[PDB]
Design a protein around this ligand. Structure first.
Ligand SMILES: Nc1nc2c(c(=O)[nH]1)N[C@H]1C(S)=C(S)[C@@H](COP(=O)(O)OP(=O)(O)OC[C@H]3O[C@@H](n4cnc5c(=O)[nH]c(N)nc54)[C@H](O)[C@@H]3O)O[C@H]1N2
Ligand SMILES: Nc1nc2c(c(=O)[nH]1)N[C@H]1C(S)=C(S)[C@@H](COP(=O)(O)OP(=O)(O)OC[C@H]3O[C@@H](n4cnc5c(=O)[nH]c(N)nc54)[C@H](O)[C@@H]3O)O[C@H]1N2
Ligand code: SF4
Ligand code: SF4
Ligand code: SF4
Ligand code: SF4
Ligand code: SF4
Ligand code: SF4
Ligand code: SF4
Ligand code: SF4
Ligand code: SF4
Ligand SMILES: [Mo]
Lengths: 250, 193, 734, 250, 193
C-alpha cells in the first residue's frame, strides 16, 4: 500500500495501439472477403483485392510510426527469426506474406486461384493473432479466453460494414448475422469474469461498454444507419478491451 | 550450468531504500522508472499489528512468461537462469510487459525494454550485485542454488518459512522471501479489500 | 431416518477391536449398534477412540459372518470345504466323544489349545489346565512379546505388561527403536505420544524406514537392519566411559554393574558406525543429549520384538541404558504398575497351575518327576513360556509323544504362525481339530466342527483387570442379544466342561451369578458395576512410596544389571555380546519388513466394508532408485517371490523414498485365500505366506521373522469385484 | 499421493447429460429460426414453430428422465423461486416460457409479433445458458470464457444444419458462415489454456477433437455432405468439452 | 451470531483415519462416498524428508461458490456460517459439484446431493462434532471465530503459521491448517514431477 519508488504498472499500449487494433481488424477481414470473392469467381474480386493491400499497408505504417524503436530500424528481425509461440510474430508474417500474395494476384501474374487459397490462409492468421496477443497473458484477469473469439467476430463486422457502405449487394445479411453473434458474446463476457475483475470493468468502462452494445443494435434497423452503427460498435468494443485490460490486479 | 538466485530475509528487512538507491546509481536507471522498489503494508489492530517491508524486482523466473511472447528473440533466458534483453533486436512492442505478472519491466527512453539484470556486468567479473553489496541489514543473499556453500543455499536451509509472489502462475520465481512476518504469509491487496 | 433421532439404549462396553481393550459406550437402536464412543473416567479411552475402535461394530452386521454350528461331511478331506449344519447339542457331544477317545489311548496332553482375545481366559488359561494339558499357547508370546518379557523378568523383578508403564507426560527426550507410533494405533499411547510432542518433547527414531513416528522426530537414524544391539552397546559404552551415568541410582538399586563396564570396553562409537552405518559423531551426540535430560530421558521398549533370533539380548541392552539413566520408577519414564484387587471365584485348585518364572529354577522342575507329561517344547530354548510355533512339529512326526486333536479359539492359524505349509501338514494328521470364530476365514474352513461365537457387543465376559499407575477393573454388558444361532464363549466352555467331568469347575449356572460373587468381595453388585463401567483402585508408581514403607519391588532385592546368575552357570553367556552380524540378502533380493496399517487390525478386519473402504489393499515400499533400475513405476503391480520360491498374489508398487535400498516393506494381514469372506478374498500380498523360515530365539522361545528375503517380478493389474457393490449387500438378521 | 478413503472427484455429468447438451443446442437454435421467420412474415414460420416445440419437449423429457431425483418430484421448485445468479435457473425459464410463447403462436391465440419478439428473447436465453453453466466454474481450468462463445455458435450450426437437410433454401449460406466462425474459435481454443490444461485436453481427448475439426471442413465441399459434416462436428465438439472439462487438477 | 470454524494442527496429525471412520459411523454415509478423507504426501530426499498428513472435507467457505449456482434454492448458507442442503428442494442437477473447488460433495443414493454438515445435528443440541470428539492426538479444534475463548480462536492465536487450500479461488475457507510441516507450505500436485 505505501512505496519507496514505484512498480512499473503504467499503461503500456496507448490510444495509438488501440487504433492499430481497429485497423488490423479491417485489414484482415477485407483480405478474407477478397480471397473468397476470388475463389468464387466474382467480378468484384479485384476491387476488394486492391483495398486490402491499402488497409494492410496503412496498418503496417501505423505499427512502425507508433513504435519508440522506429528510427533504430530493428524490425528487420521480425522477419529473420523463427518464433511460433508469439502471437505478434504470426501477425508480422501473416500480414507480410498476405501482402506479397495479394500483389501477385492484382498484377494477374505468377499464378491464379491456387494463390487465392494462400490469401485465405494468411487472412485467417491475420484475423486470429490479435485476440490471442491479449489472451496469451494469463496474468491479466480481463483478457480471458473470450478475447480469442470476440476479436475475429468483430474484425468481420468491420470488413462487412465497409463492404456494405461501398454498396455491394451481398454484404448486408452476413454483416447482420456476424453482428448478432458479436453482440451476444459481448453481452455474456462480463458474466464470465471473477467478481473483482468484473467490478473493475464496470467502474473503469461499461457505460462506454453498454453504450457500444446499444449502438450495435442499430445494425438491425434501416440502411446507411446499419453499416455505420455496427461499425462504431465493433471498433468501440475493440479499443476499450485493449485499454481497460492492462490490469494485473489483486 | 548453475541456477542463479536471490533470497530476502523479511524478518530483517526494515525497508530503508538502500538497495533501491544503489541500483539507480550503478545501472544509471533513468528518472521515472525502477529496476527495484520497496512495498510496505500494515496488517492490523493493536495487540496484533504486523508491518511487512518487501523489496520487489525481476525474479528471473525459471519458466518466464516474458520470453515466449517476444517476436524478435531479444528476450532470452540464459544457461544459468538470467532473463536478459538484447536491445539490438528489440522492437519496443511491449508484449513482454503484458506477459510479466510482477511489473518488473519498462520502456527505456532510448527506445527498448529494460529491467533488473542480476547485475550481469558484475557477475562476469566475479562480483556480487550492487543491492546485495550495500545492504546494511545483511538480509539479502545471492548465489548458485545448486552449490550448497552458496549464501542463497545456506539461507534457504536456515529459513523457518519460504515464499514467492503469485505462485499460482506458471513461473517458478528465483527470488525467495524468507521469514515472512504475517502468519498467513505474503501480504495481498485482495486480503485488505 | 437418522439413528440418533430414533430411540436409543446405551451400555458400558469394552472394545474387542484389538487387545488394548479400551472402555467404550455403545449406542444401540433395537438390535443394532450404530455408534460407539470412548468415555472420560476410563483410563484407556478418556473420551477418544482410534479408527479400528470406531469401525469394529460392522463384523456383527456382516452378511458372511458365521451363524450356525457346522460339522465336516464324513469322508471329505480337511481343506476341501464340505459341511452340514448341526445343533449346539449335537456339535458339543461330537467334540467331547472325540476328545475322550484321544484321552484313553494317549492321555489329556495330546490335546493342544491355541487362542487369542478376551475369551482366551476360558480356552487357553482355564479349560486346558482343568482338563490337564500343558500345551496351551497364544501368538502374543512367541510371535510378539516373549523377548522383552524374559529380559524384563531377569533385569527387574517385573513384567513390562499389556499397558506398557511409560510416564510419557513428564518425558523430555524419547528414543524409539522400531516402535512405529501412529501406524501402530493403540489408543492411549497415541494420545500420550501426541501430548509429549505438544509440551516440547523431542523424539529420536531408529528404523531402516522413514515411518509416521519418524515424520514427527528431531532425529531419524536410518539404521542398517538387524544391527540395533551394536548401537545400544556403544551408547552403554558412552554413558559408562564418559562418566555420564546416574551414579547414586546404580549404587542403591543395582547388582553387578562392574561386569557391564568391562564387557563393554571395546564397543566404541567407531566400532558401532562400521556395522550400524550411523556416523560415530551422531552415536556420541545422541547418548550425551539423553544423559543431559535424566531421569526424564526414556527408550520405551517396543511391543513386537521377534525380528531376528537374538532378540532377548537387544532388549536387555535397551533396559541397561534406562537403568544407567536412573529412570525406572521415577517421573520421566517408568511409574511402577500394580495389578488391581478383584478376588477370584472360589474353586478347587486346577490340575495344572502356572509358573510365572524368572529365577532359581523356572524351567522343567515340575515337568520331570512332578506328575505325568511336560509341555512338548520343553527342551528347545532356555525360558519357560509356552511357544505356539514349536508345538506344531509334535503333530507331524509324533516326536515328544503325540498331539492328535487341536482347538483354535479366535487365532489365525494361517496368518499368525510362520511356515503355513507345515501347519497344513499338521492339521492333516490330526484326529480332532475344532475352531471357534465369527468369520469364514481360510483356517476355520479346515475344521471338523466350526462353532459360531457371539460377538463382543452381544456378549458378557469375565472382568478385565489392568495393572497401572492407578489399577482398574472394566466390565462389558451385552448391547443386545446374540444373532442367528450364536453363543458366548463362557457358555461354550461351561457346556464342554460339564461333558468331560469338570462340573466342580463351572458350578455357577450363569455368568451374572459368577460376576455377582467377585463384586460381593469388593463392596458392590452387578447393577452398580453397570453404572460406572470401570473401577479405579489405589496403588503405587514411583520408588519413594515403596521405599518409605521399607520395601523395594523386583525379583531378588536389587536389580541385577548384567542380569541373571542361573543362565550364566548352565547356558553359556550372561551378557548381550550377540550383536551377531546378520545374514544378508542375496543380490537381486530385499529384506521383507512388515507392520501395521492405522485402520486394520492384524488380519480380521479385511472383510469389514467401513475399514476396507479406507484401505482396500497393501502397497510394497521400495526405494525410488531401485524401482527405476527395475522397470517399475507408480501404478504397477508385482508378485513377491521369497528365497524358497513362494509367490504372493499381485501387490501395488510404491516407489516413494522413505526406505533404505536393502529393504522392502508391506503391511501384515492381506493376501487372504478365503472365498466366503467376499471382500477380503484376493486382495494384496500376505507377509506370513512369504515367511517360510524363522530364527528361533534360544533364550525367549521367539520366532525371528525379519530373516526372510524377497524379490519383485512384474505382474498384471488384478481384476477383482467392485468393493462398493459387495459393501452394499443389506444385513438381514433373517 | 496416498489416501484413506477418497476425495469425491469422479464424473458428475455423464454421456446422458452430454446428449442433453447437444439437444438444448438444437432446441434453442430452432426456436430462433421460428422467431426470425414469424418476423419476416415468411410462410415456413408455422412448422418451424412445431419443431422448436418438439425439441423443447424432447429436451425437458430427457432432463427429467436422467435426474437422480426423477421420482422425488422436486423440479417444481425450479418454478416457485427466483435464482438470477444461476445458469440452470435461467435455462429452465427460457425453454419453459419459450414453449408457451411458441404454443400460442401455433394456436393463433394471445397476439402475434409481440409473441414473435418474446420467442426471440427466450430463445436467446436458452442459446446462452449452456456455455455459462460450464464457464461460471472458475475452478475447472478447461471451462474458460470461450465456452460462452463456443456454445452459442455451435447451437446455430445444429439448427441451420437441420433446416438444410429439410431442404429450406435460406440456411446453406448462413450455415457456412457460422460453421467457419465455430471452427476458427474451436481451433484457437487449446492455445487459450495454461500449459498443463492444454496438455490434459490433448492427452484425454484431441485425436477426437482434431477429427471433429477436420470433419467440419466438409461443410465447404460437396452440397449434400455439408449439413451432415457440420451437424456431427458441432455435436461432437459440444459433448467432448462437457466430458473432458470435469477436472480441478493441479 | 457466531462465525463457525475448524482448526487442524498438522504438526500433531498422524493420518490414522479415526475422524474419517467416526463421521462414516455417526452420519451413516453410504459405501462409495465420503464427507472426510485423509491425503498423505512426502516431500524430498534423504537429509530433508518431510511427510504431510492432511484431512480434507467441506471447508464451509465464507464466500461459497457452491451456493449462487443452484437453481432451486436447496443449497444455502446459514447466518452462523454453515453451508447446508435442504433435500426437499434438491433436483440432483450437480451444479454445486461443478462449482466446489475441493471435491467435497457427492450424489447420495436417495436422489439428492450430500456432504459434511459440521454436525449441525450435534451443534443444535450443544455438542461438538464427531470428528472432534474421537481424536487420539487432539489436533482438531472447533468453535465461534468471534469468541476469544473458544478452542479454534485460541488454536489460531497460538499457531506458528496458518494456511488454507486454493486461496486464489476467492472462497474464504473456514477450515484452517496450523503449523504445516513443509517450509513452502501446503503440498500441491503441481510441485511434484
Ligand atoms: N506373519 C506375522 N505374524 C504375526 C504378526 C505379524 O506382524 N506378522 N503379528 C504377531 C502379533 S504381534 C500378534 S499380537 C498376533 C495376533 O494374532 P491373531 O490375534 O491370531 O490375529 P488376527 O489376524 O486378528 O486373528 C484373529 C482371529 O480371531 C477371530 N476373531 C475375532 N474376534 C473374535 C471373537 O470375539 N471371538 C472369536 N471366537 N473369534 C474372533 C478372527 O476372525 C480371526 O480368525 O499375531 C502375530 N503374528
Ligand atoms: N493399527 C493397528 N495397531 C496395532 C495393531 C494392529 O493390528 N493394527 N497391533 C498391535 C500389536 S499386538 C503390536 S505387537 C504392535 C506392532 O507394532 P510395533 O510394536 O510398533 O512393532 P515394531 O516391530 O517395533 O515396529 C515396526 C517398525 O519396525 C521396523 N524395523 C524392522 N526391522 C528393524 C530393525 O532391524 N531395526 C529397527 N530399529 N527397526 C526395524 C519397521 O521398519 C517398522 O517401521 O502394534 C499394535 N497396534
Ligand atoms: S537493503 Fe534490505 S532492508 Fe534495505 S531496501 Fe534492500 S532488502 Fe529492504
Ligand atoms: S519490447 Fe523488445 S524484448 Fe519486449 S517483446 Fe517486444 S521486441 Fe521482445
Ligand atoms: S518476473 Fe516478469 S519480467 Fe522478470 S523474468 Fe519473470 S516474467 Fe520475466
Ligand atoms: S541485482 Fe543489480 S540490477 Fe538487480 S536490483 Fe540489484 S543492483 Fe539493481
Ligand atoms: S486401541 Fe483402538 S482397536 Fe484397540 S481396543 Fe482400543 S479403540 Fe479398539
Ligand atoms: S483423527 Fe486426528 S490423527 Fe486421525 S486423521 Fe483425524 S486429525 Fe488426523
Ligand atoms: S444438485 Fe441439488 S443442491 Fe446442488 S445445485 Fe442442484 S438442486 Fe442445488
Ligand atoms: S468447502 Fe465445498 S461445500 Fe463448503 S462452501 Fe466451499 S465449495 Fe461449498
Ligand atoms: S464435522 Fe460432521 S460432517 Fe464433518 S467430519 Fe465431523 S461428523 Fe463428519
Ligand atoms: Mo502383538
Amino acid at each position: 500500500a505505501e512505496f519507496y519508488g514505484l512498480p512499473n504498472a503504467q499503461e503500456f499500449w496507448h490510444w495509438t495501439n488501440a487504433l492499430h487494433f481497429v485497423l488490423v481488424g479491417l485489414a484482415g477481414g477485407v483480405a478474407l472477403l477478397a480471397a473468397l470473392l476470388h475463389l468464387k469467381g466474382d467480378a468484384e474480386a479485384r476491387r476488394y483485392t486492391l483495398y486490402a493491400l491499402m488497409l494492410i499497408a496503412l496498418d503496417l505504417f501505423i505499427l512502425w510510426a507508433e513504435s519508440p524503436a522506429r528510427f533504430r530500424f530493428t524490425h528487420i528481425w521480425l522477419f529473420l527469426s523463427f518464433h511460433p509461440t508469439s502471437p505478434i510474430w504470426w501477425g508480422a508474417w501473416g500480414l507480410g506474406l498476405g501482402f506479397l500474395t495479394g500483389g501477385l494476384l492484382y498484377l494477374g501474374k505468377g499464378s491464379q486461384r491456387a494463390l487465392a487459397w494462400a490469401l485465405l490462409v494468411f487472412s485467417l492468421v491475420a484475423l486470429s493473432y490479435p485476440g490471442l496477443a491479449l489472451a496469451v497473458n494469463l496474468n491479466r484477469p480481463l483478457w480471458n479466453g473470450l478475447m480469442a473469439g470476440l476479436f475475429p467476430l468483430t474484425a468481420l463486422v468491420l470488413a462487412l460494414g465497409l463492404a456494405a457502405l461501398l454498396k455491394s449487394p451481398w454484404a448486408l445479411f452476413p454483416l447482420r448475422v456476424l453482428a448478432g453473434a458479436s453482440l451476444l458474446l459481448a453481452l455474456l463476457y462480463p458474466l464470465t469474469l471473477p467478481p473483482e475483475a468484473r467490478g473493475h470493468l464496470l467502474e473503469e468502462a461499461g457505460f462506454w461498454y453498454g453504450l457500444f452494445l446499444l449502438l450495435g443494435l442499430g445494425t438491425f434497423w434501416q440502411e446507411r444507419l446499419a453499416p455505420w452503427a455496427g461499425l462504431l460498435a465493433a471498433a468501440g468494443l475493440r479499443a476499450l478491451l485493449v485499454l481497460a485490460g492492462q490490469w494485473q490486479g489483486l | 550450468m548453475p541456477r542463479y538466485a536471490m533470497a530476502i530475509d523479511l524478518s530483517l528487512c526494515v525497508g530503508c531504500a538502500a538497495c533501491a538507491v544503489a541500483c539507480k546509481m550503478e545501472n544509471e536507471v533513468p528518472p521515472g522508472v525502477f529496476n527495484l522498489w520497496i512495498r510496505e503494508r500494515e496488517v492490523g489492530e493493536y495487540p496484533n499489528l504486523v508491518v511487512e517491508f518487501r523489496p520487489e524486482q525481476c525474479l528471473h523466473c525459471e519458466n518466464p512468461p516474458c520470453v515466449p511472447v517476444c517476436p524478435t528473440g531479444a528476450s532470452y533466458q540464459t544457461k544459468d537462469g538470467l532473463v536478459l534483453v538484447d536491445p539490438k533486436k528489440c522492437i519496443a512492442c511491449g508484449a513482454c510487459i503484458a506477459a510479466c505478472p510482477y511489473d518488473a519491466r519498462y520502456l527505456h527512453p532510448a527506445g527498448y525494454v529494460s529491467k533488473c539484470t542480476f547485475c550481469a556486468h558484475r557477475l562476469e567479473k566475479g562480483k556480487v550485485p550492487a543491492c546485495v553489496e550495500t545492504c546494511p541489514t545483511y538480509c539479502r543473499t545471492f548465489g548458485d542454488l545448486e552449490d550448497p556453500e552458496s549464501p542463497v543455499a545456506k539461507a534457504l536451509k536456515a529459513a523457518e518459512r519460504v515464499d514467492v509472489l503469485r505462485p499460482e502462475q506458471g513461473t517458478r520465481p528465483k527470488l525467495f522471501y524468507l521469514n515472512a512476518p504475517s502468519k498467513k504469509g505474503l501480504t495481498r491487496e485482495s486480503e485488505v479489500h | 431416518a437418522p439413528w440418533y433421532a430414533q430411540e436409543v439404549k446405551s451400555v458400558y462396553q469394552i472394545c474387542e477391536g484389538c487387545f488394548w481393550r479400551c472402555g467404550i459406550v455403545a449406542h444401540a437402536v433395537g438390535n443394532r449398534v450404530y455408534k460407539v464412543e470412548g468415555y472420560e473416567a476410563n483410563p484407556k479411552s478418556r473420551g477418544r477412540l482410534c479408527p479400528r475402535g470406531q469401525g469394529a461394530p460392522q463384523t456383527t452386521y456382516d452378511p458372511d459372518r458365521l451363524k450356525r454350528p457346522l460339522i465336516r461331511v464324513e469322508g471329505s478331506q480337511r481343506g476341501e470345504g464340505k459341511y452340514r449344519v448341526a445343533t449346539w447339542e449335537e456339535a458339543l457331544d461330537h467334540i467331547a466323544k472325540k476328545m475322550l477317545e484321544i484321552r484313553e489311548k494317549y492321555g489329556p496332553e495330546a490335546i493342544a489349545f491355541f487362542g487369542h482375545g478376551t475369551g482366551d481366559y476360558w480356552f487357553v488359561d482355564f479349560l486346558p489346565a482343568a482338563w490337564g494339558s500343558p500345551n496351551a499357547a497364544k501368538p502374543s508370546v512367541s510371535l510378539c512379546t516373549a523377548p522383552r518379557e524374559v529380559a524384563s523378568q531377569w533385569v527387574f523383578g517385573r513384567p513390562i505388561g499389556g499397558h506398557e508403564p511409560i510416564d510419557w507426560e513428564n518425558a523430555r527426550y524419547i528414543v524409539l527403536i522400531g516402535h512405529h507410533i501412529g501406524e501402530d494405533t493403540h489408543n492411549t499411547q497415541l494420545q500420550d505420544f501426541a501430548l509429549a510432542l505438544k509440551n516440547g518433547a523431542k523424539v529420536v527414531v531408529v528404523d531402516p524406514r522413514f515411518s509416521t513416528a519418524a515424520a514427527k522426530a528431531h532425529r531419524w537414524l536410518p539404521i542398517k537392519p538387524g544391527t540395533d544391539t551394536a548401537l545400544l552397546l556403544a551408547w552403554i559404552h558412552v554413558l559408562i566411559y564418559e562418566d555420564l551415568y546416574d551414579k547414586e541410582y546404580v549404587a542403591k538399586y543395582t547388582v553387578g554393574f562392574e561386569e557391564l563396564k568391562a564387557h563393554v570396553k571395546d564397543f566404541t562409537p567407531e566400532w558401532a558406525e562400521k556395522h550400524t552405518e550411523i556416523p560415530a559423531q551422531v552415536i556420541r551426540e545422541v547418548a550425551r543429549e539423553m544423559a543431559a535430560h535424566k531421569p526424564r530421558a526414556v527408550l520405551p521398549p517396543t511391543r513386537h520384538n521377534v525380528w531376528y533370533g537374538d532378540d532377548t539380548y537387544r532388549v536387555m541392552a535397551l533396559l541397561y541404558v534406562n537403568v544407567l539413566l536412573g529412570n525406572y520408577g521415577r517421573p520421566g519414564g517408568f511409574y511402577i504398575a500394580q495389578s488391581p484387587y478383584l478376588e477370584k471365584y472360589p474353586l478347587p485348585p486346577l490340575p495344572l497351575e502356572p509358573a510365572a518364572g524368572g529365577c532359581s529354577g523356572p524351567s522343567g522342575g515340575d515337568h520331570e518327576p512332578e506328575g505325568f507329561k511336560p509341555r512338548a517344547d520343553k527342551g528347545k530354548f532356555f525360558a519357560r513360556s509356552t511357544a505356539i510355533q514349536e508345538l506344531i512339529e509334535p503333530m507331524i512326526t509324533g516326536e515328544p509323544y503325540p498331539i492328535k486333536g487341536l482347538f483354535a479359539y479366535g487365532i489365525n492359524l494361517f496368518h499368525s504362525i510362520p511356515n503355513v505349509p507345515r501347519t497344513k501338514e499338521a492339521l492333516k494328521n490330526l484326529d480332532l481339530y475344532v475352531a471357534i470364530d465369527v468369520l469364514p476365514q481360510e483356517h476355520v474352513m479346515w475344521a471338523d466342527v466350526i462353532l459360531p461365537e457371539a460377538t463382543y457387543l452381544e456378549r458378557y465376559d469375565d472382568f478385565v483387570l489392568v495393572a497401572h499407575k492407578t489399577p482398574f477393573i472394566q466390565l462389558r454388558t451385552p448391547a443386545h442379544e446374540p444373532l442367528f444361532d450364536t453363543k458366548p464363549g463362557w457358555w461354550i466352555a461351561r457346556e464342554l466342561g460339564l461333558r468331560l467331568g469338570l462340573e466342580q469347575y463351572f458350578p455357577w449356572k450363569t455368568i451374572e451369578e459368577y460376576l455377582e460373587t467377585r463384586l460381593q468381595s469388593l463392596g458392590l453388585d452387578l447393577e452398580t458395576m453397570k453404572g460406572m463401567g470401570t473401577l479405579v483402585q489405589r496403588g503405587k508408581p514411583w520408588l519413594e512410596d515403596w521405599e518409605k514403607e521399607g520395601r523395594l519391588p523386583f525379583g531378588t532385592a536389587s536389580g541385577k544389571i548384567e542380569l541373571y546368575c542361573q543362565r550364566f552357570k548352565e547356558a553359556g553367556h550372561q551378557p548381550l555380546p550377540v550383536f551377531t552380524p546378520p545374514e544378508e540378502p542375496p543380490e537381486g533380493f530385499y529384506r521383507l519388513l512388515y507392520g501395521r496399517s492405522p485402520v486394520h487390525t492384524f488380519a480380521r478386519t479385511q472383510n469389514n466394508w467401513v475399514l476396507m473402504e479406507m484401505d482396500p489393499e497393501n502397497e510394497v515400499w521400495i526405494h525410488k532408485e531401485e524401482a527405476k533400475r527395475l522397470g517399475l513405476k507408480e501404478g504397477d503391480y508385482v508378485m513377491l517371490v521369497n528365497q524358497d520360491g513362494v509367490k504372493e498374489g499381485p501387490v501395488r508398487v510404491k516407489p516413494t523414498a522413505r526406505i533404505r535400498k536393502d529393504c522392502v516393506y508391506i503391511v501384515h494381514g492381506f493376501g487372504h485365500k478365503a472365498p466366503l469372506m467376499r471382500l477380503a478374498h484376493g486382495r494384496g500380498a500376505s507377509d506370513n505366506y512369504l515367511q517360510t523360515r524363522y530364527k528361533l530365539d534360544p533364550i525367549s522361545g521367539g520366532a525371528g521373522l525379519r530373516v526372510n528375503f524377497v524379490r519383485l517380478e512384474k505382474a498384471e493389474r488384478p481384476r477383482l469385484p467392485s468393493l462398493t457393490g459387495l459393501a452394499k449387500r443389506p444385513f438381514d438378521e433373517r
